[PDB]
Design a protein around this nucleic acid. Structure first.
Lengths: 356, 109, 60
RNA sequence: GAGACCGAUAGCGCACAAGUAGAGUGAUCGAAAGAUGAAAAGCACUUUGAAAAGAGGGUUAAAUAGCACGUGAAAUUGUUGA
RNA sequence: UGAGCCCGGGUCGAACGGCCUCUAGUGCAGAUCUUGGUGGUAGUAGCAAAUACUUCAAUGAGAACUUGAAGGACCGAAGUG
RNA sequence: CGAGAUUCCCACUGUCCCUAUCUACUAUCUAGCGAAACCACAGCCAAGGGAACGGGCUUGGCAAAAUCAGCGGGGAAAGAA
RNA sequence: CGAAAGGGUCCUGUAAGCAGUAGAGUAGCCUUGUUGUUACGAUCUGCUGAGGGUAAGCCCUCCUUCGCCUAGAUUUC
């Protein structure tokens, strides 16, 4: 194996952390770096390729794309860090008012038996004229911090998951003075932010996730065989990975009702496969459609972040003309895009007569 | 609400027994029926009818049917200083087809 | 109760094997109380102990 | 009848239902094992326990002598204290 | 100085010691020593194959391997007779 | 089915590998039961420690309770014409 | 939340039974049959892409049905 992914250990956290935001300069406009989503599955497409110099130039190619359910995230806080001879130090964080039950579930571990008493005194700090103290915290961030991040959480109760506990993370704000970033976050308080607002189509991003576990597995599969340098038996899988350069092909709006329709296929259909995503369900929200395979199982929490470095390739400056998106069943050898197509192909049936 | 109550249930022994060893399917079916009654009526004292055992072992040790239709009756155990006041008794019921049948409460009158 | 002796003695008195004799489950107390080859004949006459028929061996 | 002998891993193998238990086809080989208390006075009765036993109570100068019994070391162990 | 000697406290119950000579089966860490007892290893290795067991009831303080009934399997007259 | 028309494969070997059958050993935890081998005391490294000698020494790297599983390293070796 | 059910999606490949003179064949009635009858019957066809399975690591549920639920034990500056 590679001595660069060792100490081959299970990921310390299920969420997966960014570990590096792109470097910040004040000249760029104010923007957010990262976002969150849940892996729904993957499907097949056909792209009219414009790669000047390729043998598939001006030809139709079949590609595999991963679909990420991305309900809008909610901003609930703002954290400010300072530079010290020992690194970055979180000087202070100021939250939003009216936190949601899902983020309070994130804070609690046994939510059902608990008195749900989190951040009540903080809301009283807003309401009872301790807004002087809160403004003092904002001004401390303005006048002492060098980098600002925003606290944001996902919407499980829109995601088709049995879970009810949300996911918090800090998304770094770049491109402006610290005062501009503080005002931006304070204005973003108690507001939903969308994936088409953070990213857009044609843009390569980086995906942070925890790759699927397989338990105690021997050297044959753990490293790929026929001291730390010697292949040993142990945990294989469930590993934190940051996979780079994945092209954002589409962002579907969820309420469009024609997410899977292209300018070539005039079929009013959505991204969800016929019968639903296997083991996941239906995508009823904003979704991100990106090229290739991506670390993580279905319904796993995923972090989507901007590229650290300005790109060096023509694959990152290309437009993606889509021809069609596969919506056949993933539960077996499916050959119909819609139930209407299946009915038109197979005619009417005995149960159709019995019901009608 | 009533402590004494009898209802009729359908058990999906197919999903309870998927992947189980063929030579242990039937005893596993008996244990899964006990667990089903314990979860449904909340009584750890579950008594199975010998003819329900007949129905489970009808098709050998590895021919357990996919769906079984049973009647579970929670009654009162008087005894003398018994550890559990209530007990569930489960019987096999005779139906044309154990599919498409909802959960129904059977009236004693 | 233990009815091994009753099983064996009933087989002996009915002239069959231990596998072809049937003791009434509802009267195990009286079968246990009966402990002689005359009391077991009493029970056989009363119907509490039965010689089961031979297994069907259809030849067609 | 005696001893400047030995004193239960000693002295005969055997201080004891020892040439016994046991082993070997057989010729043969062959152990371990003493001590309540002056006197059984060897714990009546009550209670818990299925019972074995336990706890009260009692005998005795003593149960820190209960027939796993004079005194009761070390190795090893449990509990408490530091 | 030392091998050792003496006292106090606790346990115990029947004999023992100082001094001068005599006498010897008289002084132990070893001998892969002898006999006996006791540890770590350690609640560890391990407790096989003969396909297979299940429900109710009974006795009992206690029931997988105790019984009765009902099922599901087996020896297959060169038998698990 | 039709004088029906056309296409492909047939080997030997004292060789190797794989599939198939049979034989044998193959097994984590829980309840209960339950040994033996072996045991001066120990067990982290690198350099140095004249006698091809290090495990305890010098001086350095360091070094944080109690454990579970896997295991491929160490705790084994000469005697010299 | 759990158990059923319904719908969807996948897998297999057309259930049991009945009927049609379609039916290769197997036999009786009476006399010649130029169209004789009466019974049985492989196989065929129709009812029938039906019948069965479907989450056990598939998808959805407007009051689809039934049931459950503010517990009980320990520990913490």
């Amino acid at each position: 194996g590679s001595l660069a992914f060792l100490p081959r250990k299970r990921a310390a956290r299920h969420r997966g952390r960014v570990k590096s935001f792109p470097k910040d300069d004040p000249k760029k406009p104010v923007h957010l770096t990262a976002a969150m989503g849940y892996k729904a599955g993957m499907t097949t497409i056909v792209r009219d390729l414009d790669r000047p110099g390729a043998k598939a130039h001006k030809k139709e190619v079949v590609e595999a794309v991963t679909i990420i359910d991305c309900p809008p995230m909610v901003v609930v806080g703002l954290v400010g860090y300072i530079e010290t001879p020992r690194g970055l130090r979180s000087l202070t964080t100021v939250w939003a008012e009216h936190l949601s039950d899902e983020v309070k579930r994130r804070f609690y571990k046994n939510w059902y038996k608990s008195k749900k008493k989190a951040f009540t005194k903080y809301a009283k700090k807003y309401a009872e004229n301790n807004g002087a103290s809160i403004t003092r915290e904002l001004e401390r961030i303005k006048k002492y911090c060098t980098v600002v991040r925003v606290l944001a959480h996902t919407q499980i109760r829109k995601t088709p998951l049995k879970q009810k506990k949300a996911h918090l993370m800090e998304i770094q704000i770049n491109g402006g003075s610290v005062a501009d970033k503080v005002e931006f976050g304070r204005s973003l308080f108690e507001k939903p932010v969308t994936i088409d607002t953070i990213f857009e189509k044609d843009e390569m991003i980086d995906v942070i996730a925890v790759t699927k576990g397989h338990g105690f597995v021997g050297v044959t599969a753990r490293w790929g065989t026929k001291q730390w340098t010697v292949a040993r038996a142990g945990q294989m899988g469930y590993h934190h990975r940051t996979s780079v350069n994945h092209k954002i092909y589409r962002i579907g709006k969820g309420d469009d009702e024609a997410n899977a329709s292209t300018e070539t296929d005039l079929t009013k259909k959505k991204i969800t496969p016929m019968g639903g995503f296997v083991r996941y369900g239906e995508v009823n929200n904003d979704y991100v459609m990106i090229k290739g395979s991506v670390p993580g199982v279905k319904k796993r929490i995923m972090t989507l972040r901007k590229s650290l470095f300005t790109h060096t390739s023509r694959k990152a400056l290309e437009k993606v003309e889509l021809k069609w998106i596969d919506t056949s069943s993933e539960f077996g050898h499916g050959a119909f895009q819609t139930a209407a197509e299946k009915k038109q192909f197979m005619g009417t049936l005995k149960k159709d007569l019995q019901t009608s | 609400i009533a402590d004494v109550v009898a209802r009729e249930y359908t058990i999906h022994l197919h999903k309870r027994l998927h992947g189980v060893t063929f030579k242990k399917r039937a005893p596993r079916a008996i244990k899964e029926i006990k667990k089903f009654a314990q979860k449904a009526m909340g009584t750890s004292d579950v008594r199975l009818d010998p003819q329900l055992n007949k129905k489970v072992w009808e098709q050998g040790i590895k021919g357990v049917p996919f769906r079984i239709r049973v009647r579970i009756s929670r009654r009162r155990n008087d005894e003398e200083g018994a550890k559990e006041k209530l007990y569930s008794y489960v019987q096999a019921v005779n139906v044309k087809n154990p599919k498409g049948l909802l959960t129904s409460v059977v009236e004693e009158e | 109760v233990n009815l091994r002796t009753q099983k064996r003695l009933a087989a002996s008195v009915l002239g069959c094997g231990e596998g072809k004799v049937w003791l009434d489950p509802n009267e195990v107390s009286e079968i246990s109380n009966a402990n002689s080859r005359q009391s077991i004949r009493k029970l056989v006459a009363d119907g509490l102990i039965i010689k089961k028929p031979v297994t069907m061996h259809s030849r067609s």
